[PDB]
Design a protein around this nucleic acid. Structure first.
Length: 312
DNA sequence: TTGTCGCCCTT
DNA sequence: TAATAAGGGCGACA
């Protein structure tokens, strides 16, 4: 995996194009099978065979903003999507321990780090909001969980409304009702007199990473879980409640659309955003939809989890 | 030592 | 559509 430098269809070992490689260089095979997008500059192409490229990083270049954009082989992408299903199972398996950490800690002092960590995790289990790196608030004015400010939180008699503009300039709005364990903690954490101050003012990227580590997962894995949970809950609702049960793919398309609408994915991106490939393997036998119709969601969830575990 | 950067990878 | 944008995780850095 040496990075070779690309200029008009030709490869060089150096960024100034003084050292051309042999026309027989294995990397020319890669160029037979990929198209380099023409908006990229300063392109590098890794020196490897096509069979190797298929499984990992293929080429990289700069977009108009100067960001290095990284392009992977289809087997890498396939693998990545498999890992997502496994991550679903991993989070599923650790949620009890997370809720134990949350439920213990939300009884604590408002300016305690572990209290803020408990509220952070609890917001994640509820709304699946992205991590919220500082970088993107600075760069793009993007807000996520870590970058929430008191201005984003509105308290009213029996509810709390969280409103912000997250990735891709999509507005999000979440509601916490009085009966919910999150209500009182959030009520006490938010500081209405400091609207420009961060809500998690005792947190830091370092603190969040060190805390999530105890559960053997990343914060983004919580989102993966919540989004696919919502997916599966929609699929289950649909099989249970739709009057004339729709065709297999009309059913999935409908379920992708309902999820996309609430998560805030575009109708294009939503297509492949969730665990629709899993539902595809499962509908492959005739009994499935019958079984699902006769399940509680918890037992449906366990059937789906069991499928993923035993898939590979 | 601890908030920020940049590379790699993901959505 | 057709053209191709912007998040997270974590080592690296002073």
């Amino acid at each position: 995996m040496r990075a070779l430098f690309y200029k008009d269809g030709k490869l060089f070992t150096d960024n100034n194009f003084l050292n051309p490689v042999s026309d027989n260089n294995p990397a020319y095979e890669v160029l037979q099978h990929v198209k380099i997008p023409t908006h990229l500059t300063d392109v590098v192409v890794y020196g490897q065979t096509w069979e190797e490229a298929l499984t990992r990083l293929i080429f990289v270049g700069s977009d108009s903003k100067g960001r290095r954009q990284y392009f992977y082989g289809k087997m890498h992408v396939q693998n990545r999507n498999a890992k997502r299903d496994r991550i679903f199972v991993r989070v599923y398996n650790v949620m009890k321990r997370i809720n134990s950490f949350i439920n213990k800690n939300i009884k604590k002092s408002s300016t305690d780090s572990n209290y803020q960590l408990a509220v952070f995790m609890l917001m994640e289990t509820m709304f699946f909001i992205r991590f919220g790196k500082m970088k993107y608030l600075k760069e793009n004015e993007t807000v996520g969980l870590l970058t929430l400010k008191n201005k984003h939180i509105e308290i009213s008699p029996d509810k709390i409304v969280i409103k912000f503009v997250g990735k891709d300039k999509v507005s999000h709005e979440f509601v916490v009702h009085k009966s919910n364990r999150l209500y009182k903690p959030l009520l006490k954490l938010t500081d209405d007199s400091s609207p420009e101050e961060f809500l998690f003012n005792k947190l830091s990227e370092r603190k969040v990473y060190e805390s999530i580590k105890q559960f053997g997962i990343r914060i983004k894995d919580l989102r993966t879980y919540g989004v696919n949970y919502t997916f599966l809950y929609n699929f289950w609702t649909n099989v249970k409640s739709i009057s004339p049960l729709p065709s297999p793919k009309k059913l999935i398309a409908l379920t992708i659309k309902q999820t996309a609408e609430v998560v805030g994915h575009t109708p294009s991106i939503s297509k492949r955003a969730y665990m629709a490939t899993t539902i595809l393997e499962m509908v492959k036998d005739k009994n499935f939809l019958d079984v699902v119709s006769k399940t509680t969601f918890d037992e449906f969830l366990s059937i789906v989890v069991d499928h993923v575990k035993s898939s590979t």
